[PDB]
Design a protein around this ligand. Structure first.
Ligand SMILES: Nc1ncnc2c1ncn2[C@@H]1O[C@@H]2COP(=O)(O)O[C@H]3[C@@H](O)[C@H](n4ccc(=O)[nH]c4=O)O[C@@H]3COP(=O)(O)O[C@H]2[C@H]1O
Ligand SMILES: Nc1ncnc2c1ncn2[C@@H]1O[C@@H]2COP(=O)(O)O[C@H]3[C@@H](O)[C@H](n4ccc(=O)[nH]c4=O)O[C@@H]3COP(=O)(O)O[C@H]2[C@H]1O
Ligand SMILES: Nc1ncnc2c1ncn2[C@@H]1O[C@@H]2COP(=O)(O)O[C@H]3[C@@H](O)[C@H](n4ccc(=O)[nH]c4=O)O[C@@H]3COP(=O)(O)O[C@H]2[C@H]1O
Ligand SMILES: Nc1ncnc2c1ncn2[C@@H]1O[C@@H]2COP(=O)(O)O[C@H]3[C@@H](O)[C@H](n4ccc(=O)[nH]c4=O)O[C@@H]3COP(=O)(O)O[C@H]2[C@H]1O
Lengths: 304, 303, 303, 297
């Protein structure tokens, strides 16, 4: 039943795929990825060596690392994601998100992957990023007592990264060693995991800078549709996601990188954690495909 | 007048990154007190590069001009009780501007004796603004480089200490004429440790194993609708911890020494905006003993 | 098993001295769990000496018998959260006596596989009482040396774990039939690090360059909430804070590593009466991350 | 006698309450068999509470003849105060009488006073020589730049009876101290740590003449849950010295008495009973005369 029958030989060049976090804006990510596999003609896990999605990557990265194809990812996304954001609450949203992770990821763990994976979350008590992984070669410290995915299924590891404090309740995690960790959304610490993934493919799995091909895929920038100290909250988050893209620009310059995210200006865009109109989201998917065509010349050079 | 010993040229390039505190800057003065006494020479003769946030900038600028630690302590114990005593946002920023007028009036980023870097993120681009001292410390756009954006040190250092919730956003006019607006330099990086290592490796052609980082913090102390304020205090903490947790991942093989201890007794409940010279003096004593626990390690770094 | 690493015998003597603070021993289990996994073997195959105190007595003995850290945690989480639930100080003693009977049924100080020592204070003479394991660890009166004072290893632990204001006073009967009155061992020395260096220099006379002392504490936490009560708690702090200040002057050429971190947030507030199973869990992982910051220097002493 | 013999004879003095007449009688018999003042046949002098007063006076001048004179006049007065605050003012008055304006600069021998801090909770030891500290050299001002009149008053501040003396160091930081009895009521061990690690002396080069005050009988559970911990620290530190420094020739002069008529209450303002302690203690020297003159030569 497979329609992609292309075989690419092994090489000494790593290819990293770093997805960003946008919530319900993942349709822009599905649009650009749907034409990336078409240029390759093969499943994505057969060409890439590392995927590091954050909150939305948690979803698309976990599905890509299992061996899914973008047609199947898009089918599940349009059917269930608009149902999650339909409830205006914090407990009711976590209840619905609980079943979505259960139906798509039944019982699989971080040993059923076919490539290097990593999901970003945030510890609420010590304020440090919690990065799930799949292999012991990606760890930097404490080589002993290493348990892939902390012995936790994909159902909880992804849902924990999706607990957006302002919209979702907090998520508790029980490690294989009995540790009861409480987590929240992974965006608060890093919303653009490009800096982490490059640090993952440079310290662990030591490779040269000239032998890495990083491809970042955002969600695009959109105009926004009682300032009780809430303006600062919005500002400190933007200052946080900014100055990181500025940081990796100074630290990693000799590493070829491509970012796919276009800014929109006309008053026809809206927020993400409240958009549930099928027609509204359908327009974002087409905009992502157009953004691919303008850069198809360079993407063919890297992905070959 | 008493410090006279001199040190020859050396290939190892040290670096001093000063944390950004507040009225708790006495801890940093206590730590640096024995460090200069142990060396026996002014700080600008041994260190090759200094980066500081708001509190640290006041000390970083004065060290770069030639002020000794005892002189900085004199200027600190005299004026601080005033600016921290006002009960208005426009009152604190007004008196703080007069203080900068008296310590240094006709001084820009050209009279400094060493490499300096002062942090401040903006209000429109949401990116840092790092006032450097020399053209070699830049990364790009090395065709239009005025040493310090043409701005004087008086209003440059004031911009770093502009905590928006309690101060007013300092508006700066550069030499080119671009009206830039900045806020407290601790909103993007409360600790310039990572920046100092970045500005010393990809900017200055120096490999690892030849860099000694000395991050002199200020110490952690207890504290004496509410949905947004709790989240604001926590988000500022995540960026503080995520930045150091990222530093030891990349630059793990770089010899670093962080001097900042923690205290848990309720009698030391120091917070921001402190003016009582009693509690502010005890914190200076704590900074003196923290050097005693790590003296046997620092002697290899500073020789 | 899954721990099948065999290390060759060398002249270096590795000492491990545990502290005691009550139900906060989970910090010690979290650190020791990472040290065992780093070695790949039980702890009694690499160390030559292990001491303990009010809590150490429970972990120092189990390590000398041959147990594993994964097994000690498999016991410390089913009875320790139970003994602290008793209301009276007498019921807290009737319960602790049954536990040693079920874990140390018949073993004495003769079937140990390393150098053991437990600290306890006499009530009349008011001096330390150290239950040694071998005659080579004595400093006089070797003619009448009886290992463990002829007392079972189950009774020599209930003494150190008997705080007078919270438990009863434990009286023992040694081999010579001497009814000795004992109390908790945290009154003369809560950190036996100075005792351990004292026991590896005059007895088993090694040089100062051939000892690697590894101290493990239980961390420091704020209070979760008269005149003599204040002085009672005040004098205990002066005793322990001046003892480690004394060994720093005496033994400085001896490499030491202390693993203890200070906590100040109002959520990490505990004492030696905690019985909340969830609150005890967070203290366990708090010590594990404390090992990660020091993993690069621990591997230098013990491979 | 002779100038130097490469021997580091230390003199650790204990202390507590008005019972210091004992060590006065013991010291009075000494300095007589020698013929020279005490500051000439000694290289180090430590003292915590009462010996501290005796430590300074020997280290800067007058001998035992004048010390007992200053002790028999003023001491019976400061103890005759019912309020806790009055004892501090009178004790401060006594300080400015004999210690008018002298500091730690005009001391003729190595001295050390013991007083524990109230905040950091660890001893604070005043010294008077450049080579007397083990670390943190530099920023080293002899005696913290504080006058002897205030350094000794701090070392004599029993908090339940006196008031916590506040000292302003020459650097400018105010330090809150209490007596040196809460940390170490016996500077014998501290004298070995300073004479061996700092002065770098061998293990058979020093002689330790520790002079006590003697043990005497006595005339809510926290009251007697407090005196006990204070003596556990005194006994535990004594035994630890025997373990580490068994090869150190020491001579402790402190006898015990069980007679009921010898019961003191640490604050006896009585001239007839404080004289018996001065008598009983002139004979304690006679029981070790044939041994002491091998140490002091
Ligand atoms: N690429 C990165 N970019 C930015 N930050 C990163 C990155 N990688 C790690 N960190 C941060 O550094 C801290 C220590 O990482 P270490 O690799 O040194 O040790 C790891 C490993 O040994 C083990 N482990 C990891 C993954 C897994 O699936 N199973 C598993 O067992 O647990 C520790 C993880 O704990 P956290 O993840 O909670 O903390 C991390 C993270 O905050
Ligand atoms: N170590 C670091 N880690 C992380 N980010 C860093 C670091 N260092 C700089 N940056 C960020 O990189 C952005 C661009 O810096 P560039 O060095 O590439 O070009 C500089 C220079 O050519 C010129 N110039 C600089 C200093 C001066 O006194 N006069 C002057 O004229 O202006 C540009 C300054 O712009 P900003 O300072 O506003 O923004 C910076 C900063 O946010
Ligand atoms: N490292 C140290 N640092 C500081 N002080 C230390 C240290 N080690 C010991 N001490 C103290 O020195 C005191 C005298 O000990 P001794 O060695 O001179 O004689 C011992 C021994 O011969 C015998 N005996 C000992 C243990 C046993 O299991 N069976 C057994 O029979 O009983 C005597 C009484 O021992 P305690 O242990 O009760 O009292 C000790 C201790 O308080
Ligand atoms: N024999 C001992 N046994 C047990 N503990 C001991 C012993 N000796 C010292 N200590 C402890 O060691 C801690 C730090 O001592 P340091 O030697 O490292 O530096 C000294 C010195 O350089 C300088 N200074 C000293 C004397 C003076 O008249 N003016 C002056 O300026 O101040 C520091 C004093 O501080 P504290 O005295 O408050 O604390 C001491 C003490 O608690």
């Amino acid at each position: 039943p497979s329609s992609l029958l292309t075989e690419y030989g092994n090489d000494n060049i790593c290819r990293v795929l770093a997805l960003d976090g946008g919530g319900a804006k993942g349709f822009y990510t599905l649009g650009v990825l749907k034409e990336i596999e078409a240029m390759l003609g093969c499943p994505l896990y057969k060409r890439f060596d590392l995927v590091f999605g954050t909150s939305t990557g948690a979803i698309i990265a976990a599905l890509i690392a299992l061996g899914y194809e973008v047609d199947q990812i898009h089918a599940l996304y349009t059917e269930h994601v608009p149902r999650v954001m339909s409830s205006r609450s914090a407990a009711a949203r976590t209840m619905a998100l609980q079943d979505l992770a259960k139906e798509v990821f039944q019982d699989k763990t971080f040993e059923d992957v076919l490539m290097g994976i990593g999901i970003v979350a945030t510890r609420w008590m010590t304020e440090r990023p919690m990065i799930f992984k799949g292999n012991v070669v990606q760890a930097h410290g404490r080589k002993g007592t290493f348990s892939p995915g902390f012995g936790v299924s994909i159902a909880d590891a992804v849902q924990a990264s999706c607990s957006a404090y302002p919209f979702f309740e907090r998520k508790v995690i029980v490690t294989a060693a009995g540790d009861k960790v409480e987590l929240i959304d992974g965006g608060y610490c890093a919303n653009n995991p490009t800096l982490f993934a490059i640090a993952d493919a440079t310290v662990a799995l030591k490779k040269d800078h000239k032998d890495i091909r990083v491809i970042n895929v955002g969600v695009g920038i959109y105009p926004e549709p009682k300032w009780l100290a809430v303006q600062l909250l919005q500002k400190t988050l933007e200052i946080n996601t900014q100055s990181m893209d500025q940081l990796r620009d100074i630290l990693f310059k000799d590493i070829p990188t491509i970012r796919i995210s276009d800014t929109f200006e006309r008053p026809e865009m809206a927020t993400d954690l409240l958009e549930y109109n099928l027609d509204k989201l359908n327009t974002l998917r087409q905009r992502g495909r157009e953004s691919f065509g303008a850069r198809e010349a360079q993407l063919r050079e890297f992905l070959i």
